[PDB]
Each structure stands twice: as C-alpha cells, then as structure tokens.
Amino acid sequence: NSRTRPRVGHIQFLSCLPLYWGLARTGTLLDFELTKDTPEKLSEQLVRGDLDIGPVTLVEFLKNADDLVAFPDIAVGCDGPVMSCVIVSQVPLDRLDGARVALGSTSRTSVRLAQLLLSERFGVQPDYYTCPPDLSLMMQEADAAVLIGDAALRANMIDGPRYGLDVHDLGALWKEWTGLPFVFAVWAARRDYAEREPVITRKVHEAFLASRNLSLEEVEKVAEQAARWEAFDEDTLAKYFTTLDFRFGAPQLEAVTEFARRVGPTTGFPADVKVELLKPLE
Amino acid sequence: DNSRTRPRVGHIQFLSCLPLYWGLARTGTLLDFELTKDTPEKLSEQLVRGDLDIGPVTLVEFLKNADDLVAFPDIAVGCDGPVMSCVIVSQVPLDRLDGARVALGSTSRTSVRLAQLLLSERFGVQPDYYTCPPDLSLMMQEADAAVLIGDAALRANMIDGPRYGLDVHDLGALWKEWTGLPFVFAVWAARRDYAEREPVITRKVHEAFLASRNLSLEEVEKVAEQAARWEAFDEDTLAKYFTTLDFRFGAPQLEAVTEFARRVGPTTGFPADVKVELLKPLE
Ligand SMILES: C=C(Oc1cccc(C(=O)O)c1)C(=O)O
Ligand SMILES: C=C(Oc1cccc(C(=O)O)c1)C(=O)O
C-alpha cells in the first residue's frame, strides 16, 4: 500500500521533446510513471482515469473542465506562427466551399480552430472528414488537409515547398484574425487525483516548470541531438523550439477565453466555461 | 521520411535497473533511444521476435537464441554471492522438498532454471514443480516453496519472509556456495540483423549504456534516496541492494555463464557449449 508514482502523460511529438530532455536531465522522470502517445490518446487516457496528470489538447480540456485542474505557467502554444499546426491546401482557402478537407485524427483543437477560421473568417463550408494523418494520401482524395505534430512540421518545412503546396500556419491565421496568441494544449491533473494527493500534484507541477525552464536554456543542445534522428536539421529544430511558446499566464488565458467563447456553441461546451488553475500554497 | 530512426531499446522496469535508468536520463542517452519498459520475459520475447532492436535478455533466453543475438561486453545484471532479488522462499528446509510442491514465478526464465539445477543437482531433491503468476501469498497457501525474481523477490527477502518466519534462500549465494562463481541473470544484446545493418548505432548504444551505468555507480545514494519515496523499501535497503548487484560482464562473469550454460543447456534448449558472440570493439 506504499505510495505510487503519478501516472504522467507526455506528447511524443517534437514539440515536447525539449521538455522530455529537461525531465530526464533533472531526474524528474524517475518520479513519474510516464506514458508517451499522441495528444488525442493522452487526453482520452487522462479523462478516462488511466493517467493522473498529463497534457490535454485544449478543446478536450474545455469539454471536461469540471473534472480537470490546469497547471499554471506551462502550456503548448504560440504568439504568431506555431509551425506544427497547418492547413495544407492545393487551392486558395476561399475556394474550399463545398470542397473536401481531411482532418488529421490526432487533432482535436487545431481542427476546430481551422473550421472556425474557414467559416467565420474566410466564409467557406467544406465537406469535412477525419482520417489518419498522411499528407500524400490526403492530397490524393481531398483538396486540403489539417495536420499537427511532426507531420505538420514536415509539411511546412519540407513537403510543402517541394511540391508547391500552400501551407497556412494556424497560429498565424489566428494572430492575423485576432491579434492574440494561441494555446493548443495545457497540462492538467484529474480533479480527483489533485484532491487526493495535493502534494504530489504540486511537486509534479513544479518539476514540469523546472524541466521546461531547463529545456529553454539548453535548446541548442536539444536541437543538435535531435537533428541526428530527423529529416529536420539543427537550425530548423532550434527555430521550431524557440518559436513555440510554453508560457501560460494572463495573456495566454485571455486567448483561451476568447477561443472558447467563439467555438463553444459549435463544439459541445459552454461559451463561458470555467478554467480551474492549480493554486499554490500560501 | 527515410531519415535515420532511433534504436528501439528495452529496459527492465524492476528496481535492479532503476539506477541505470537514472543514468540514461541524466546523460541524455534516453533521447537517443525509443525506450520500451517491461518485465524481463516480455522484453526478451520482443527482442527475439523483432519488436526491439537492442535490449536486456534473461540469460536462458539469450542462450536459446545465441546464434541471432550479439551480447554487449562489460554490462550485465549479475552478482558475486547474494543477488537479493532472486530467491527460493520455503516453509521447510530445502532437503525436505523431495516430492513437495514448488511454485515457479512465471516471469522468470533463468532464476527458475537455476533453482531447479540447485535443488536437483546440489541438494538432490525432486519437487513437483508448477508455474504460476508471481504472488507470494497465493504461492505459500498452495506450495511448500516458491521461486521469485525482481521486486517481488526483494520484497519477500527484506519484508515478507522475516515477518512470517519464512526461509528465504538467495539463489546467487546458493550458486556461489556450490561453485565459487559469480552469476549473470541477464545480458544486454542487439539483434544480429540490427547489429550488422547499423554497426555504429549499435556501438554508440553500447557505449552509452556503459557511460550511464558508470554514472549510476557514482550516484547510487542519490538514486536510492529518490526511489525510497515510492517504495516500501527505505534508502538504506535500496542502497545496499544497488551496491550488492554486480553489473560487470568480463572474463570472470563469462566463465560463470559458460559453466551454467554447460550444466543446463541440453535440458533447456541450447547446446552445452553454446557460443556467446560479443560485440566487437573498433581497431
Ligand atoms: C504544437 C502543437 O499543437 C497541438 C498540440 C497538441 C494537440 C493539438 C491538437 O490539434 O489537438 C495541437 C502540435 O501539434 O505540434
Ligand atoms: C537480478 C535479477 O535477476 C534476473 C533478472 C532478469 C530476469 C531474471 C530471470 O529469472 O529470468 C532474473 C532480478 O530479477 O532482479
């Protein structure tokens, strides 16, 4: 009946590879029982109780906000381009009305942001369908596709330029539309776990912040090492890691508030949903 | 995407390899791996069938597949005397086990074979063996003795045994008494096809393991202090366990492997003189 390590999720994509570096170098990993997977699986596992703490794609957090406690000061976001959330299209976006648009199944938030932009900014109503993320296949059978993660970064930096495909950065489209930054995923504890183990939850939160901070300082070391295992080179990875925005304070919460209000009534949660933050000790 | 992919590397989830995990994390080596954590018998099955490229292999399963695996020199999971986490728990003296029931934990391949070798060829008793999931409570309700490995064995050795007045015999000590030799329970190996396709990645993985192991030897007390917060064992117990384990794999350890293989080979599924191929260093 001894104390057991928290079950902690971790996004397998490159976006959170520097964070993984920090968790390893600080020794934090030895205080976790870590699960690596794609964002939609990690969100399903946390909501279903197979994890205690982990990253949650924003839309799924909002649909479950009464049962989750978000960690302050860490998130996966951007202020302008995010580079790894894109619309790849063979035509201008305003020509997508009634066209087929493939939505990568690993996404919940970026697909909704893309749908919001296309309808409310560009005024087109495509015929959406979900499918596994595969740019080559998606382009054969759809006129445009929404991708996240490594596949999106690959479409943005490699596939797009080679084949003359338009690649629209969803963070940039949102920044153009609203002037706001964007948050794609947060870290959260299950409410029942945070109330049963307040101290473990706090130490996990603080360890994430320290590991994140360390990864910011050693971004070039992380990029050099990771470049040996990717089609991206060191400069591209370092640019990607430094373009991503892992803050989660008042300006980022303002962005979440506005996004939630615009998509709630079309996504399945109240437009004024409450985001509960983990409170520090007095 | 035809870029080079990280090696798929297995890692024993038990406490025995927790300091090594610390070393792999602290050195940053983990970011050069695609890591899979599991029990020794699953990690062995995955490597043999091709779901991993490099990983720990319980000795008996390595020897049964020695033609298809290349062992890493100078790192292994072993002992010279007690190993602490491979035990026979018995309610009677070992010499009273002839015709008695002995439960063999299903997660083991090497320690169970070593226990059978000791009981038959050293003590001369012929128990009615059976395999079951590792659970000391159930095993003791139905058997006169049980063979355990991993955390469950360490728990029987340091906690359950003393509490219930059960004899706990250390399999490493029993073998040492019988032979004067150390013992190797698991080795690290690369699949032969992976080692021949990617010699340099295999070498760098091997070197990274040695460097992570060496660091974990230096920081054993830090690792025990951290791990004690999540285990029924305290820091002193974990530190004694980590320092009792022997992770060397040179000539004296290979001598032990050779003799163990000779005594059990023809009844376990490999030649008594099976050849152990070691990863060769560069000139
Ligand atoms: C930085 C990214 O933004 C994300 C992260 C996690 C989930 C989602 C989603 O769309 O559900 C988006 C990235 O995927 O690289
Ligand atoms: C030191 C140990 O020895 C082992 C390790 C892995 C497998 C086996 C086996 O019996 O198959 C034994 C331990 O379990 O901690």
Curated annotation (Swiss-Prot), chain B:
Effect of disrupting the coding gene: Cells lacking this gene require menaquinone-4 (MK 4) for their growth.
Annotated keywords: Lyase, Menaquinone biosynthesis
EC number(s) stated in the UniProt entry for this protein: 4.2.1.151
SUPFAM superfamilies registered for this protein in UniProt: Periplasmic binding protein-like II (SSF53850)
Claim: GTP-binding is one of the keywords in the record: no
Gene Ontology molecular-function annotations: hydro-lyase activity
Catalysed reaction equations from the record: chorismate = 3-[(1-carboxyvinyl)-oxy]benzoate + H2O
Pathway, per record: Quinol/quinone metabolism; menaquinone biosynthesis
GO biological process, one term: menaquinone biosynthetic process
HAMAP family listed in its UniProt record: MqnA (MF_00995)
Function of the molecule: Catalyzes the dehydration of chorismate into 3-[(1-carboxyvinyl)oxy]benzoate, a step in the biosynthesis of menaquinone (MK, vitamin K2).
Family: Belongs to the MqnA/MqnD family. MqnA subfamily.
Name used for this protein in its record: Chorismate dehydratase
High-level lineage: Bacteria, Bacillati, Actinomycetota, Actinomycetes, Kitasatosporales
Recorded name of the encoding gene: mqnA
